[PDB]
Copies of this chain bind each other. A is one copy, B any other.
C-alpha cells in the first residue's frame, strides 16, 4: 500500500480526528475497497511553521519510510507575525521550505505542496493578512515548479469557492470555523482536493 504522510500544522493534526479531512479520506478508501492500496497518516502539530517541520522531520517523517509526503504548512509562518511577532521571514521561509523538499526527494519520496487556505474568508481582499498569504502562496507555487512537485492550490480553491458561496462577505463560517481552522464542510472540501491530487 502506498504510504502517504501529511506533514503540517493544526489543520493536519485536527485532520485525523473525527470529521477531519484525513479521517474522511480514510473512510472513503474503506467504502471504495482500497484500504489495501493506501495508508494515510497525519503528522501535524498545532502552531507549526516551516522551520518546525525541518526540526522534527527525521523522527516524524523520514523514519517512517513513506512513499508520499504532502506538505501543508505556511499559514502560521504568516499568522504569527500578527499574533506573536514570530512569523517567518519570506526569504528564510523559502530557504527552510526548499531544504525540507531536498531532504524528502533525497529519500526518493514523492512530495506535494499545499498553499495556505486562509486567514479570513472575506472575498474583497480585506482580510488583515491576505497580502502575505498570497505572497507566501506565490513562493510555494514557485517551489513546486522549481522542484517538480505536484501542487495542491488550496489558496486558489478556497478563494474560488468563497466567491461562489459568501454573498454576505463573512470572515469565517464558509470553509473555516474561525478564519483559519476548518469546519465540517471545509474538512470535506480539503479531503476532496487531497484525494484528487494524491489518490
Partner of A92, one of B14, B16, B52, B87: B52
With an 8 A cutoff between CB atoms, is A35 at the interface? no
A132 to B125: give the CA distance in the assembly, Å: 9
Stretch at the interface among A104-112, A143-151, A178-186, A190-198: A178-186
**Residues of A near any B CB (own CB < 8 A):** 10, 14, 16-19, 46, 51-52, 54-55, 59, 64, 80-82, 84-89, 92, 95-96, 99, 120, 124-132, 134-135, 138, 164-165, 177-178, 183-185
The main secondary structure of chain A at its interface with chain B is helix
Distance in Å: Cβ of A28 to nearest Cβ of chain B: 12
Identical copies of this chain, number: 4
Would you call A185 and B131 a contact (CB within 8 A)? no
Q: Which residues of B contact A164 (CB under 8 A)?
A: 18
Distance in Å: Cβ of A148 to nearest Cβ of chain B: 23
A129 to B135: give the CA distance in the assembly, Å: 11
Would you call A89 and B84 a contact (CB within 8 A)? yes
Q: Which residues of B contact A18 (CB under 8 A)?
A: 64, 164-165
A51 to B86: give the CA distance in the assembly, Å: 12
Among all A-B residue pairs, the 3 with the closest Cβ atoms: A81-B85, A126-B135, A130-B131
Would you call A55 and B95 a contact (CB within 8 A)? yes
Q: Which residues of B contact A165 (CB under 8 A)?
A: 16-18
